[PDB]
Amino acid sequence: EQESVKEFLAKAKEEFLKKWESPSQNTAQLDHFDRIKTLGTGSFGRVMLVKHKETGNHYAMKILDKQKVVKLKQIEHTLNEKRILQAVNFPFLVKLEFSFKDNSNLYMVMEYVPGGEMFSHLRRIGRFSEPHARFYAAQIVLTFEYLHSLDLIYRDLKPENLLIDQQGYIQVTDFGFAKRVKGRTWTLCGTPEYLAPEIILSKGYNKAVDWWALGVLIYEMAAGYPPFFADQPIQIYEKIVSGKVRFPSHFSSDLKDLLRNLLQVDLTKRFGNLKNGVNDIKNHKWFATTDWIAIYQRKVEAPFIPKFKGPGDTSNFDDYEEEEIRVSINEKCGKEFTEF
Ligand SMILES: COc1ccc(-c2nnc([C@H]3CCNC3)o2)cc1
Ligand SMILES: COc1ccc(-c2nnc([C@H]3CCNC3)o2)cc1
């Protein structure tokens, strides 16, 4: 690789390690914000649109219930999420602006991206043309190049976690399964449709699982549906381990060739995990029209710009029951969350 790429990644790792070793803590509190709307929910928390009362700036506030985190065995994963987010910096990652806790909850306050999830736009239009899919895929290739050089694995790539911003570019959100890993790791986690074979077979696995998930994402963007699906997870898993995939006839020959090498069931033969690493992907014929520097600099005109009226518009997100943010008069689970 060119020395300019090597020096860029060496500086990125230096800046990450300084924040990783000395994390920020307790940088706002709940009554500094007004609550506006619930943007989405989940197994042990939700994300709310909020407005800061002194500056007027909008944020996306992720709220996790401490007792429920403990019951669903997610303590280590929650601590991973906040420690990684306060230490990274890259054009296509959401920015964490504040974090804090109280007697009942943990809070992560991020810059708000009003354009909505990629999932909504893909399901609305049906599928993306190959140039449109390729513009998004290039941003994910550069983001994984960055995260993997910091010894991080992301482990939750899927369309609902890719937000579309005011310039039509991607910002990746939700680091709940991200982890710093020197060699191998073992936890069963992810969404069934995106899991690599070595996770399903309970092996020790590495960053090659993120390149498998990139193959599932590019197939889904260009076809409109993922390659492996069924009503029961055990049926999805049998299809993933089989080593067979079927492609629509409208796919280009170059796209089919790239996807056979990302959706390779033998992890020692998979693109992204060979001696040349990410450069086997960047140099593939499907990416021949891509200007990697121009994408990083945000100089390429996007395929589309989401429709929205202002920085507080919620029209690209959907409607959920509005529930209280209740804070107990007694402290819960203080010991488990000391480092947060
Ligand atoms: C950075 O600005 C945002 C905006 C919205 C969300 C968000 N909205 N919903 C979710 C989860 C629940 C349903 N899917 C994922 O995250 C995150 C950050
Ligand atoms: C009863 O058999 C098991 C199997 C797996 C696990 C397990 N899977 N993940 C974890 C956490 C420790 C490693 N980081 C997350 O424990 C625990 C008990």
Instruction: State whether the beta carbon of 283 lies less than 6 angstroms from ligand 2.
Output: no
CB atoms within 10 A of CB 10: 10
Report how far residue 220's alpha carbon sits from residue 200's, in angstroms, rounded to the nearest whole number: 20
In angstroms, rounded to a whole number, what is the distance separating the alpha carbons of residues 237 and 239?
5
Query: What is the Å distance from ligand 1's center to 16 Cα?
Result: 24
For helices 253-262 and 208-223, what crossing angle results, to 10°? 150
CA distance readout (Å), 118 to 17, 220, 232, 249 = 31, 12, 25, 24
Q: What are phi and psi of 106, to 5 degrees?
A: -105, 145
Q: Which residues contact 171 (CB under 8 A, 6 or more apart)?
A: 92, 93, 94, 113, 162, 163, 165
Which residues sit opposite 164 in a β-bridge? 170
CA distances from 151 to 9, 50, 91, 145, 159 (A): 12, 33, 19, 10, 24
Interhelix angle 130-149/3-21, nearest 10 degrees = 60
Cβ within 8 Å of residue 190, ≥6 positions away: 155, 156, 177, 199, 213
Nearest ligand by distance to the CA of 176: 1
Degrees (nearest 5) of the Cα angle 324, 172, 323?
A: 10
Can you read off the two tokens belonging to residue 208?
């090659």
Whether residue 79 contacts residue 64, with contact meaning beta carbons closer than 8 Å, is answered with no
Q: From the CA of 36, how far away is ligand 1's center (Å)?
A: 14
Q: Backbone dihedral region of 202: left (phi > 0), alpha (psi from -120 to 50 degrees) or beta?
A: left
Q: Which ligand has the nearest atom to the CA of 93? A: 1
**Residue 241 in contact with residue 201, Cβ under 8 Å?**
yes
Which structural domains are found in the chain, ordered by start? Answer: 5-22+117-307 (1.10.510.10), 23-116+308-338 (3.30.200.20)
239: part of which helix (H) or strand (E)?
Answer: helix 233-241
Instruction: Kindly state the tokens that stand for 170.
Output: 């991607």
Cα 93 to Cα 249: distance, rounded to the nearest angstrom: 34
- Quick one: which atom of ligand 1 is closest to the CA of 110? 1
Query: How far, in Å, CA of 10 to CA of 4, rounded?
Result: 10
Residue 166 is given by DSSP the state T
Nearest alpha carbon to residue 313 among 48, 111, 49, 114: 114
**Residue 52 CB-half CA count within 13 A:** 16
318 lines ligand 2 (CB under 6 A): no
- Of 10, 162, 6, the closest CA to residue 92 belongs to 162
Based on the residue annotation, tell me whether 156 is a catalytic residue of this protein: yes
Say which DSSP state 185 is in: B
Distance CA 279, CA 145 (A): 10
CA 153 – ligand 2 centroid, Å: 18
Is the distance from CB of 163 to CB of 171 less than 8 angstroms?
yes
Q: Which of 38, 39, 85 to mutate to test the pocket of ligand 1 (most atoms within 8 A of CB)?
A: 39
CA of 324 to the centre of ligand 1 (A): 18
CA-to-CA dists, residue 78 to 68, 139, 146, 178, 274, angstroms: 12, 26, 22, 9, 31
Answer yes or no: is the C-beta of 110 below 6 A from any ligand 1 atom.
yes
User: Which bound ligand lies closest to the C-alpha atom of 79?
Assistant: 2
Instruction: Report the nearest-CA residue for atom 2 of ligand 1.
Output: 112
Asked if 111 contacts 93 with a C-beta cutoff of 8 angstroms, the reply is: no
- The experimental technique behind this entry is X-ray
**CB neighbour list of residue 243: distance below 8 Å, 6 or more residues apart:** 265
Resolution of the model in angstroms: 1.6
Which residues are annotated binding-site positions? 39-47, 62, 111-117, 158-161
C-beta separation of 60 from 111 below 8 A: yes
* Residue 269, C-beta contacts closer than 8 angstroms, at least 6 positions apart: none
Find out whether the beta carbon of 187 lies less than 6 Å from any atom of ligand 2: yes
Going by the annotation, the residues of the binding site for ATP are: 39-47, 62, 111-117, 158-161
Q: Is the CB of 113 under 6 A from ligand 1?
A: yes
**Neighbour-count burial of 180, counting CB atoms closer than 10 A to its CB (0-12 exposed, 13-18 middle, 19+ buried):** middle
- CA nearest neighbour of 166 among 130, 119, 116: 116
What residues contact 166, with CB distance under 8 A and at least 6 apart?
114, 115, 305, 306, 308
- Mutating to test ligand 2, I would choose from 69, 73, 79 the residue with most ligand atoms within 8 A of its C-beta, which is 73
Helix, strand, coil content of the chain in percent (nearest 5): 35, 15, 45
Give the Cα separation of 323 and 38 in Å (integer). 9
**Ligand 1 nearest atom to the CA of residue 171, by list position:** 1
Task: Give the number of other CB atoms < 10 A from CB of residue 199.
Answer: 21
CA-closest candidate to residue 160, choices 126, 188, 120? 120
Q: How far is the CA of 118 from the centre of ligand 1 (A)?
A: 11
Task: Say if residues 33 and 52 touch (Cβ distance below 8 Å).
Answer: yes
Phi-psi region of 238 (alpha: psi -120 to 50; beta: other; left: phi over 0): alpha
The number of angstroms, rounded, from the C-alpha of 79 to the middle of its chain's C-alpha atoms is 16
Give the residue whose CA is nearest to atom 16 of ligand 2: 187
What lies within 8 Å, CB to CB, of 272 at 6+ separation is: 144, 207, 208, 210, 211, 214, 262, 278, 280, 281
CA distance 160 to 171: 11
How many H-runs (helices) and E-runs (strands) does the chain carry? 11, 9
